[PDB]
C-alpha cells in the first residue's frame, strides 16, 4: 500500500538519520526565503539547529542513534502553510500583469 511505500522511501532517504525534518531540506529559493523570513523565532531557531547539527554529523560522517531519528508520522510540515501562501501571492502578481 502506498502509505507503507511513502514510509519506506522516507527511511530510505535518510534525512531522518540526521535528525532533520522534510522542510529543512527544500531548495533555497526566492519563494522559499520569503517563507523562511516569515517564520517565528522559536520555529526558526529550531530549524537552524536541526541543520547545524546535521552538518556537524556529515563532517564526521556519522549519524544519530535510532532513538533520535525523525519519525515519518512526526514529519512536521512546518513550512508549507507559509509557503503555499507565498506561491499564491506570486500567481496573483503574474495574473495581474496579464
Amino acid at each position: 500500500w502506498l502509505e507503507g511505500i511513502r514510509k519506506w522511501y522516507y527511511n530510505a532517504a535518510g534525512f531522518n538519520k540526521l535528525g532533520l525534518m522534510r522542510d529543512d531540506t527544500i531548495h533555497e529559493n526566492d519563494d522559499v526565503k520569503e517563507a523562511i523570513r516569515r517564520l517565528p523565532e522559536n520555529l526558526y531557531d529550531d530549524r537552524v539547529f536541526r541543520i547545524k547539527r546535521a552538518l556537524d554529523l556529515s563532517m564526521r560522517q556519522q549519524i544519530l542513534p535510532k532513538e533520535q531519528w525523525t519519525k515519518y508520522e512526526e514529519d512536521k510540515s512546518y513550512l508549507e502553510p507559509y509557503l503555499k501562501e507565498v506561491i499564491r501571492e506570486r500567481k496573483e502578481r503574474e495574473e495581474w500583469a496579464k
Partner: protein, 411 residues
C-alpha cells in the same frame, strides 16, 4: 436632493446624498481615536493609519493597492484624538469595488505580523515629517499637560514603542472599538439602500478627559518661540462652545487677507501696539465630545515672547471685564458663519461635518440651523466665556529658545 439618514438596530448609522457628482465619495467614520489608547498600547492608532493597504481575509495587500489604482480611485485615512476615518474616492461606475476593499480593511483585517514589522519604521518617518511643522510639538506637548489620560494621548507613536506594537494589541483594539455601535457610514453621489445593502450584509457586527493643567517647556535651538496658553472649555454642541467659537474670531484666528495686517484681530493689533518686531498670534479653539480647549497660539522671537504673551493675555482680560461691543461681536459672527459654510463647501470638508455630527448626534444638523445657533449667541456669554479663560486654571506649552519666556504664574 436631501441628505438621507437613518440608524440600524445594532447602532450603526447611514447617510446618503446623491449629489449627481461624477465622482462618488464614501467615508466610514468611527469613535476610535487616540483617547481610547491606554499607556500600554500607545502608538497603536498611528500604526492603523498606516495599517490600511495590508492583507485581509477578503483580499491581499497587492490586490487592494492595484485594484484601487486600476480604476484611479483613492484611499485616505484621517484621525483625531476622538475619531478615525477611512475614506475613498472613485467614479460612481466603480463604487462596488472600493467598498469591498474598504470593508475588508475595516471589518476583517488579518494583520499578519511580518507585514506589520516591515511597517513599523514608517512611523518614525510620518511622525518626524509632521514634526517639522513645529505646531505639532506644541499641540501634542500641550494636551499632555492640560489633560491626564485620555485626550492627552498623542496621535503619534512615541519613540520607545517603535517595533513593539504587536498584532495582538491591534486585533484587541479592533474588537474593542470597531463595533457597529460606534461607526457611521457615509456616501455621496450614492443611493441610500446601497449602503443599507452593504452594511446589513457586511458591517452587521457586534476614558474621561480629566483636566489637570500644567506646563511643558521644550528648550530647543530655534530663533522663533512657539507657545500656547489655554484653559478648559466646553464640549462641542453646547451653546457655551459656540460662544468660544465667536470669541475665537473676535480675537482673530488667522488672516482672511493674504499678507493683511489683521486689522480686526484684537490680539495682533494689541501686540502691535507694544511690539515692533516680527510676530504672529491667533485664537486657538479645540473642542471635543467630553471637553475642549480654548486660548491662543503664539509665535515670537526668543527675546520678545514675554511681551507678546502678556499683551494677548491682557487683551482677552479686558474683554472679560466687559470691554466688548456688539458690532465687534457681530463681525465675528459673520466670520463664523463664513468659516463653517466655506469648510463644508467641498465634498470632503462637507463629509467630515456630516459624520462627526452623526457620531456626536443622532441626526445631521443642517447648516441653516447652525447659523441660527450663531445668532443665538449673546455678547455677555462671550464675555463670561473670556472670564473662564482668565479665571480657570491654565495649561501652557512652548518650544524654542526660552531664555526670556515666562511661566503660567507670571501671567
Amino acid at each position: 436632493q436631501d441628505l438621507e439618514f437613518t440608524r440600524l438596530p445594532n447602532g450603526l448609522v447611514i447617510a446618503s446624498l446623491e449629489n449627481y457628482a461624477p465622482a462618488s465619495r464614501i467615508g466610514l467614520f468611527i469613535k476610535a481615536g487616540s483617547r481610547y489608547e491606554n499607556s500600554n498600547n500607545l502608538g497603536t492608532s498611528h500604526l492603523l493609519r498606516l495599517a490600511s493597504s495590508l492583507t485581509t481575509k477578503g483580499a491581499s495587500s497587492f490586490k487592494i493597492t492595484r485594484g484601487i489604482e486600476a480604476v484611479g480611485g483613492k484611499l485616505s485615512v484621517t484621525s483625531t484624538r476622538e475619531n478615525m476615518a477611512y475614506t475613498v474616492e472613485c467614479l460612481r461606475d466603480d463604487v462596488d469595488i472600493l467598498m469591498e476593499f474598504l470593508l475588508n480593511v475595516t471589518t476583517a483585517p488579518e494583520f499578519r505580523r511580518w507585514e506589520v514589522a516591515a511597517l513599523q519604521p514608517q512611523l518614525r518617518i510620518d511622525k518626524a515629517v509632521a514634526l517639522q511643522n513645529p505646531q505639532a510639538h506644541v499641540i501634542e506637548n500641550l494636551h499632555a499637560a492640560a489633560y491626564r489620560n485620555a485626550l492627552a494621548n498623542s496621535l503619534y507613536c512615541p519613540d520607545y514603542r517603535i517595533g513593539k506594537v504587536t498584532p495582538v494589541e491591534l486585533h484587541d483594539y479592533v474588537q474593542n472599538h470597531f463595533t457597529s455601535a460606534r461607526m457611521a457610514l457615509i456616501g455621496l453621489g450614492v443611493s441610500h439602500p446601497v449602503l443599507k445593502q452593504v452594511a446589513e450584509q457586511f458591517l452587521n457586527i457586534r476614558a474621561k478627559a480629566k483636566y489637570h493643567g500644567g506646563e511643558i517647556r521644550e528648550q530647543n535651538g530655534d530663533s522663533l518661540v512657539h507657545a500656547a496658553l489655554v484653559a478648559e472649555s466646553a464640549a462641542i454642541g453646547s451653546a457655551e462652545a459656540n460662544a468660544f467659537s465667536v470669541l475665537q474670531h473676535v480675537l482673530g484666528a488667522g488672516p482672511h487677507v493674504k499678507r493683511g495686517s489683521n486689522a480686526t484681530s484684537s490680539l495682533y493689533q494689541a501686540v502691535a501696539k507694544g511690539v515692533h518686531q516680527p510676530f504672529d498670534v491667533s485664537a486657538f479653539n479645540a473642542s471635543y465630545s467630553d471637553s475642549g480647549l480654548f486660548g491662543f497660539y503664539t509665535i515670537s522671537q526668543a527675546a520678545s515672547a514675554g511681551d507678546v504673551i502678556k499683551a494677548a493675555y491682557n487683551q482677552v482680560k479686558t474683554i472679560a471685564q466687559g470691554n466688548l461691543s456688539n458690532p465687534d461681536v457681530q463681525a465675528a459672527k459673520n466670520k463664523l458663519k463664513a468659516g463653517y459654510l466655506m469648510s463644508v463647501e467641498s465634498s470632503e470638508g462637507f463629509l467630515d461635518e456630516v459624520g462627526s455630527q452623526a457620531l456626536a448626534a443622532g441626526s445631521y444638523t443642517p447648516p441653516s440651523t447652525v447659523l441660527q445657533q450663531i445668532d443665538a449667541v449673546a455678547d455677555a456669554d462671550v464675555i463670561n466665556a473670556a472670564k473662564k479663560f482668565v479665571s480657570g486654571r491654565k495649561s501652557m506649552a512652548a518650544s524654542g529658545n526660552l531664555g526670556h519666556t515666562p511661566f503660567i504664574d507670571e501671567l
